Design an enzyme around this catalytic site. Structure first.
Site, PDB file in Angstrom:
ATOM      1  N   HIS A 102       0.819  -1.216   0.000  1.00  0.00           N
ATOM      2  CA  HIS A 102       0.000   0.000   0.000  1.00  0.00           C
ATOM      3  C   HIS A 102       0.855   1.269   0.000  1.00  0.00           C
ATOM      4  CE1 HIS A 102      -3.931  -2.133   0.911  1.00  0.00           C
ATOM      5  NE2 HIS A 102      -3.069  -3.016   1.382  1.00  0.00           N
ATOM      6  N   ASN A 175     -10.100  -2.885   2.923  1.00  0.00           N
ATOM      7  CA  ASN A 175      -9.888  -2.877   1.482  1.00  0.00           C
ATOM      8  C   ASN A 175     -11.224  -2.630   0.787  1.00  0.00           C
ATOM      9  OD1 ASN A 175      -7.112  -3.314   1.550  1.00  0.00           O
ATOM     10  ND2 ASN A 175      -7.255  -5.519   1.120  1.00  0.00           N
ATOM     11  N   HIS A 366      -3.130   0.860  11.920  1.00  0.00           N
ATOM     12  CA  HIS A 366      -2.861  -0.503  12.362  1.00  0.00           C
ATOM     13  C   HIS A 366      -4.142  -1.092  12.942  1.00  0.00           C
ATOM     14  CE1 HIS A 366      -0.648  -3.924  13.982  1.00  0.00           C
ATOM     15  NE2 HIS A 366      -1.288  -3.719  15.118  1.00  0.00           N
ATOM     16  N   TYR A 389       1.705  -4.499  12.156  1.00  0.00           N
ATOM     17  CA  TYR A 389       1.551  -3.053  12.008  1.00  0.00           C
ATOM     18  C   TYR A 389       2.282  -2.243  13.067  1.00  0.00           C
ATOM     19  CZ  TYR A 389      -2.100  -4.099   8.587  1.00  0.00           C
ATOM     20  OH  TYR A 389      -2.814  -4.574   7.523  1.00  0.00           O
TER      21      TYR A 389
HETATM   22  C1  HDD Z   1       0.942  -9.970   8.563  1.00  0.00           C
HETATM   23  C2  HDD Z   1       1.074  -9.086   7.589  1.00  0.00           C
HETATM   24  C3  HDD Z   1      -0.121  -8.450   6.998  1.00  0.00           C
HETATM   25  C4  HDD Z   1      -1.296  -9.063   6.591  1.00  0.00           C
HETATM   26  C5  HDD Z   1      -1.712 -10.502   6.646  1.00  0.00           C
HETATM   27  C6  HDD Z   1      -2.084  -7.926   6.077  1.00  0.00           C
HETATM   28  N1  HDD Z   1      -1.434  -6.753   6.134  1.00  0.00           N
HETATM   29 FE1  HDD Z   1      -2.092  -4.839   5.690  1.00  0.00          FE
HETATM   30  N2  HDD Z   1      -0.338  -4.111   6.076  1.00  0.00           N
HETATM   31  C7  HDD Z   1       0.715  -4.753   6.653  1.00  0.00           C
HETATM   32  C8  HDD Z   1       0.743  -6.061   6.968  1.00  0.00           C
HETATM   33  C9  HDD Z   1      -0.256  -7.020   6.713  1.00  0.00           C
HETATM   34  C10 HDD Z   1       1.910  -3.861   6.990  1.00  0.00           C
HETATM   35  C11 HDD Z   1       3.228  -4.369   6.399  1.00  0.00           C
HETATM   36  O1  HDD Z   1       2.045  -3.762   8.419  1.00  0.00           O
HETATM   37  C12 HDD Z   1       1.455  -2.514   6.443  1.00  0.00           C
HETATM   38  C13 HDD Z   1       2.436  -1.901   5.439  1.00  0.00           C
HETATM   39  C14 HDD Z   1       2.986  -0.621   6.056  1.00  0.00           C
HETATM   40  C15 HDD Z   1       2.147  -0.467   7.286  1.00  0.00           C
HETATM   41  O2  HDD Z   1       2.162   0.533   8.000  1.00  0.00           O
HETATM   42  O3  HDD Z   1       1.372  -1.545   7.511  1.00  0.00           O
HETATM   43  C16 HDD Z   1       0.074  -2.796   5.856  1.00  0.00           C
HETATM   44  C17 HDD Z   1      -0.655  -1.846   5.226  1.00  0.00           C
HETATM   45  C18 HDD Z   1      -2.042  -1.892   4.912  1.00  0.00           C
HETATM   46  C19 HDD Z   1      -2.863  -0.751   4.453  1.00  0.00           C
HETATM   47  C20 HDD Z   1      -2.408   0.644   4.196  1.00  0.00           C
HETATM   48  C21 HDD Z   1      -2.604   1.520   5.420  1.00  0.00           C
HETATM   49  C22 HDD Z   1      -2.132   2.906   5.089  1.00  0.00           C
HETATM   50  O4  HDD Z   1      -2.809   3.544   4.264  1.00  0.00           O
HETATM   51  O5  HDD Z   1      -1.064   3.326   5.592  1.00  0.00           O
HETATM   52  C23 HDD Z   1      -4.106  -1.264   4.300  1.00  0.00           C
HETATM   53  C24 HDD Z   1      -5.347  -0.535   3.845  1.00  0.00           C
HETATM   54  C25 HDD Z   1      -4.024  -2.684   4.670  1.00  0.00           C
HETATM   55  N3  HDD Z   1      -2.770  -3.021   5.000  1.00  0.00           N
HETATM   56  C26 HDD Z   1      -5.112  -3.572   4.685  1.00  0.00           C
HETATM   57  C27 HDD Z   1      -5.072  -5.032   4.863  1.00  0.00           C
HETATM   58  C28 HDD Z   1      -6.206  -5.846   4.664  1.00  0.00           C
HETATM   59  C29 HDD Z   1      -7.591  -5.407   4.283  1.00  0.00           C
HETATM   60  C30 HDD Z   1      -5.728  -7.123   4.911  1.00  0.00           C
HETATM   61  C31 HDD Z   1      -6.454  -8.408   4.850  1.00  0.00           C
HETATM   62  C32 HDD Z   1      -7.533  -8.618   5.579  1.00  0.00           C
HETATM   63  C33 HDD Z   1      -4.305  -6.969   5.241  1.00  0.00           C
HETATM   64  N4  HDD Z   1      -3.941  -5.676   5.206  1.00  0.00           N
HETATM   65  C34 HDD Z   1      -3.389  -8.062   5.589  1.00  0.00           C
END
Ligand code: HDD
Ligand code: HDD
EC number: 1.11.1.6
Lengths: 727, 727
Positions: A102, A175, A366, A389
């Protein structure tokens, strides 16, 4: 010393103005009187500029910001030039790591307000009274591409909302589809690595159309449901304003009596559901890679505030096992036909940030950021998200004090015994940095859980089982939800799904991967599988043709709430029309056009073959917004051509192509007077056809017909005609 | 446990193959027999995979990489799952800050060899012996956009070469134009901020077409020279293989006798100079944002190695003041008519990296990395660069040990008294970490300067002047070099410059900025200024029409070396042709086409309306590479249509548009037999026209005529005909 123009035309008006009418500006300068508790709380860190001296970061006034200090005016630069070194040092360290996923996103401030008290189902303070106004910061995003990738890619979209509540920050991190690709967080790096640019050469950006993604999909049928959504037009929204949002996971609401209710979260767009078509979306990544970011910012500057209604699907604890699927499986949706979405409040996005980096790039959302009145479930994807997160911010935002970055700060009180860490802002005066303590009378103190202003206590769910790395057997069904989605789409939506799979699989180099994916599609629906196979030159075997389709979902043959278009909901306010000018426009046409568009809140861009002005038949001077090539039809929702000196543009290739591109992309086209001669370039017969408005002049009926077409978004009945159009 | 197909079609052949014939692969798997000293030295850090167990980073074998550890198979995830946490932690911290500028780049390994010893003019070891092979690593880049932005933007390109010499790393960090935008490094953050996405909303990506860039330009006329280059087709190269490279600054060569010679560095592309046209480049950022990265990788995989000849412009010290411009002014070029480029050696790029992140993303180039035999000058832009490239790595690469990252390591010895720092790899055994020391007999020891293998000593340039922040008056001329460039371009190159300024300024919202830029153009050339003004609806005043043109540059009114096309240098090897198939191709046509293309090293892609195969008239089965829409004409250099069942594609909109797009973009088109009926869609009369090859069959001189057109790159004579084409 003044470089601004004497007429003041450098400064945008601090009032709502339509797209393109003024230069865009930081939110606090464009809309200084739009306020909320969070925006006001940022005033302590906002920095102005007008009438101030240019200084170093240490406050020393700079006399010459044009030159390095050197030994002679043609000599070597001196190490003692601290002004140069400070300025270059700051420049040299401007960039921080982008989000792992993202990374590409666009954000705005706003507020949320409930429709009624939800105290009977949750003790969450922000839902306790319709008078509770909660500031929000919302970031919309793609998933795969980098921060510098394009907006209108085919991808899932993120929809993340930070609620600054009186009892803590709640982040709803969702999402634009109601399920995810995978079941267990342990696989997240595998899935993300597969969809991301491949590791040898870092290609392709912003696309799932490559071998490793479809390899993973073909080997992990749990992905097929969300793949279906991504291959549909859901993967290419018209605007962040015209998509749905979903929390995906089942969470819990906890009331003051301790009762848990299962909940899934929904955002319903006031502007309705609307998407591009693939050829338009792909070309638009080239013509304007910032299209969604731009449209969001400009809607807010115009007063066309994005609005989304928050809705809850609510399931009593005793109903956990009453469905054909597992409520904790994030690859399964809850059909609205089975569990309706109950609307509970509304969110309005009404101010852009001041500084993209400081507010958007540094924002940390988060889903573990919950408040009393909410709780988690054992959804094994959600469970692992809770770890990621917080962890990721240590590198992305430079350490554990990321909550002190202004956009991330709670607006409610926060006090604890945590200390130090890189870039520590808060200066603690507590004699104690531990509890229990007597030296500060044990403050700050724990608070028991309770109906309001109580401490957080987890719902005391019963856990029974052995320590296992094992998927629940209830999760091991992969095809019924994809099929329900497929059967719920209109025929043209189904065609676009077929074309999505066909286009993407054509870009997979290893043919056996294509064949394995087609085999998976044959387990979902044989009409879908045969259509994709035909586009790939694949012939299904008799065995494949005899695969029994999966069962219906709890008796459902379809659920129209899964279609973008089956149930009309579109609204035209905030859309935009291209008006193709000529050097002697019939002013009566343009008067009627602009009056009708204004009454509906539809914007217009006046286009010509050059910039500057043209003069209408009555002497009206018409300012030109862009050239035909500078603002292509991809960027508008419909095209109108008024009468006048049509000979001026009749042989203009760009003008003819403008209409052909709009025609191919199913957009409404309206032609007045001699502009009807353009029917020849789009191969429309003299008798006309549905979707092409024509009349001797533009008038009320002419504009009513066009705005009716716009309310329906696109002219789907034109699809059989576009394959012969060379555009 | 095998998921690979039994036929082995997952594995690309480890031999040279043309683009699209095989999946692309890490360089050491695709071309294991290609080697150099640097590639060999990286073997210690290369990691395999086949036949190995999947483990944690601590070496513990993993049994179940599909599931988190939970209390029951439907239970909560346990904190004791160290396998999950390690995997997610690594994922959570994958990203590092991107480069402040030039974040988007593509890199390859290769080697350099001088043609003869240059010891008469430099003691640099890598230039001392024609048998001395120096490994190189080269990164090409854009400037403005992020790492996820598009390749075929309008921008300057970077061309950075790391030479791993026996006497240290020498980085030649240049661009694809011979000057820069600004004179003094102190202004670099100002210029870069102005061109980068604007800070409120972070728009636009990869584009200078916005208010702040043109605001800065209009207020800083020193920028106009490089702006002229950026607005020309130089700003949109066809490939990294088809652009020039330049060090920009005057440096010094120092010989063994201590004599200094001024030098400017040049790279001459063996493939010649070639660029896209704007509409094509912009649309291509949408159809394939990875086009240049892909083309570079695939040329190397095909054995069609990018080659560049290093050349020096050499100026004796006593000639420093003999020109109309200052040699130390980086906004001025040295015309080749005045100082010829003398060839020095050849560089061949012959192997792709294994891992893009590890080798490309983490590579650190810096122009202060020189070796004995080279030295700096007082060029005030170069002087400040020397500070930045070391400083920036402290955040980008995590600390001061960035030279220990494998791609950055010297291949020659390095030993000193520096210690510690984050990520320290080298374990020093020296009892001493200081000098002078007796406890290690003062090792490692200083080395006096000398003719070979000596220590670095700066050339003892005389410095005389007061400590001043002041621009040299000799730098205060801004218009002569832009005018020389303008007058050296062909008429069609001039039109493309006019169109570049016109398009970009149309995207500037504040009209006074456009007017101020047009006023600056009037100081360069009135024909240019009038043509841009006309496209903007601006009328030049009488005073503007009377601005005296700037003087010639040392008597020159043109220098044809500044034009891409005035002197033909095109070579067709490595170009690509689209072949539009039908369902019953005339096999004799296709045989002649492919035979002639193969003889010249020109690649082909067979296109159709679907994937799979078609069968020719004689039964030959033809594999389809892509659909018409999947591989648009933007991605090829010419289009050929063989005969056959032309009725199969005659009414196909995509096939007709394929030819119209190629026609608009000036590409050669060849039509055999009944394919000549496609002349109607491009409005070509029966008589034909230059640039459209046609014959009863593809035999005879048909392919010679087409390949001759391809050698000339584009059909410039077609320009008067394209404006009527709706494409
Ligand atoms: C275990 C790891 C993991 C899993 C399984 C998911 N995500 Fe995630 N997501 C992250 C790890 C992550 C992250 C790496 O922690 C991020 C990237 C940078 C951050 O700050 O958080 C992130 C970012 C992130 C953002 C952007 C937030 C922003 O605008 O800064 C969104 C909207 C989502 N995720 C949504 C989801 C949805 C709807 C998931 C499924 C239900 C999902 N993520 C599964
Ligand atoms: C004082 C600041 C400054 C100035 C005046 C310049 N640059 Fe620079 N350049 C940097 C500061 C910098 C940098 C911030 O240090 C970068 C970005 C990240 C890095 O490692 O170096 C860089 C990167 C960078 C790269 C990319 C290297 C790579 O592929 O990793 C190239 C090709 C150039 N520059 C070339 C130039 C040229 C031809 C210049 C004008 C003659 C120039 N730079 C002026």
């Amino acid at each position: 010393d003044s470089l601004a123009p004497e007429d003041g035309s450098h400064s945008p008006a601090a009032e709502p103005t339509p797209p393109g009418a003024q230069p865009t500006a930081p939110g606090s300068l464009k809309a200084p009187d739009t306020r909320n508790e969070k925006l006001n709380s940022l005033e302590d860190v906002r920095k102005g500029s007008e009438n101030y001296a240019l200084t170093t970061n240490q406050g020393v006034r700079i006399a010459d910001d044009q030159n390095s200090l050197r030994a002679g005016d043609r000599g070597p630069t001196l190490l003692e030039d601290f002004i140069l070194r400070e300025k270059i040092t700051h420049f040299d360290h401007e960039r921080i790591p982008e989000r792992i996923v993202h990374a590409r996103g666009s954000a705005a401030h706003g507020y949320f307000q409930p429709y009624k008290s939800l105290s009977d189902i949750t003790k969450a303070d922000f839902l306790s009274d319709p008078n509770k106004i909660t500031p929000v910061f919302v970031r919309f995003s793609t998933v795969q591409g980098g921060a510098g990738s394009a907006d209108t890619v085919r991808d899932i979209r993120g929809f993340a909302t930070k609620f600054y509540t009186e009892e803590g920050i709640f982040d709803l991190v969702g999402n634009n589809t109601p399920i995810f690709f995978i079941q267990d967080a342990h696989k997240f790096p595998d899935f993300v690595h597969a969809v991301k640019p491949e590791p040898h050469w870092a290609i392709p950006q912003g696309q799932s159309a490559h071998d490793t993604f479809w390899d993973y999909v073909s080997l992990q049928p749990e992905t097929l449901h969300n793949v279906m959504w991504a291959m549909s037009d859901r993967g290419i929204p018209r605007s962040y304003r015209t998509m749905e949002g979903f929390g995906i996971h089942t969470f819990r609401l906890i009331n003051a009596e301790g009762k848990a209710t299962f909940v899934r979260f929904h955002w319903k767009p006031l502007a309705g559901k609307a998407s591009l078509v693939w050829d338009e979306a792909q070309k638009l990544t080239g013509r304007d890679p910032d299209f969604h970011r731009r449209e969001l910012w400009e809607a807010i500057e115009a007063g066309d505030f994005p609005e989304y209604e928050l809705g809850f699907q609510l399931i009593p604890e005793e109903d956990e096992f009453k469905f054909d699927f597992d409520l904790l499986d994030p690859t399964k949706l809850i059909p609205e036909e089975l569990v309706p979405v109950q609307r509970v409040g509304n969110m309005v996005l009404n101010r852009n940030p001041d500084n993209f980096f400081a507010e958007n790039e540094q924002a940390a959302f988060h889903p573990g950021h919950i408040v009393p009145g909410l709780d988690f479930t054992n959804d094994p994807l959600l469970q692992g998200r809770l770890f990621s997160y917080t962890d990721t911010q240590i590198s992305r935002l430079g350490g554990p004090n990321f909550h002190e970055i202004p956009i991330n700060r709670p607006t409610c009180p926060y006090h604890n015994f945590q200390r130090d860490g890189m870039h520590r802002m808060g200066i603690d005066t507590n004699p104690a940095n531990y509890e229990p303590n007597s030296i500060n009378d044990n403050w700050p103190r724990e608070t028991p859980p309770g109906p309001k202003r109580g401490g957080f206590e987890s719902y005391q769910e019963r856990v029974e089982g052995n320590k296992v790395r094992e998927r629940s057997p209830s999760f091991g069904e992969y095809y019924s939800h994809p099929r329900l989605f497929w059967l719920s789409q209109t025929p043209f939506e189904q065609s676009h799904i077929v074309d999505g799979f066909s286009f993407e699989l054509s870009k997979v180099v290893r043919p056996y991967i294509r064949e394995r994916v087609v085999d998976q599609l044959a387990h979902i629906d044989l009409t879908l599988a045969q259509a994709v196979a035909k586009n790939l030159g694949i012939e299904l075997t008799d065995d494949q043709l005899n695969i029994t389709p999966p069962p219906d979902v709890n008796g459902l043959k379809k659920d129209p709430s899964l279609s973008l278009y089956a149930i009309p909901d579109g609204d035209v306010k905030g859309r935009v029309v291209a008006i193709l000018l000529n050097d002697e426009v019939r002013s009566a046409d343009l008067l009627a056009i602009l009056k009708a568009l204004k009454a509906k809140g539809v914007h217009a861009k006046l286009l010509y073959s050059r910039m500057g002005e043209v003069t209408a038949d009555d002497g009206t001077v018409l300012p030109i917004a862009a050239t035909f090539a500078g603002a292509p039809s991809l960027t508008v929702d419909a095209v109108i051509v008024p009468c006048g000196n049509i000979a001026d543009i009749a042989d203009n290739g760009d003008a003819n192509y403008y209409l052909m591109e709009a025609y191919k992309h199913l957009k409404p086209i309206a032609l007045a007077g001699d502009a009807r001669k353009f029917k020849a370039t789009i191969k429309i017969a003299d008798q006309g056809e549905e979707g092409i408005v024509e009349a001797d002049s533009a008038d009320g009926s002419f504009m009513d017909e066009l705005l009716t077409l716009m309310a329906a978004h696109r002219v789907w009945s034109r699809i059989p005609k576009i394959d012969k159009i060379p555009a």
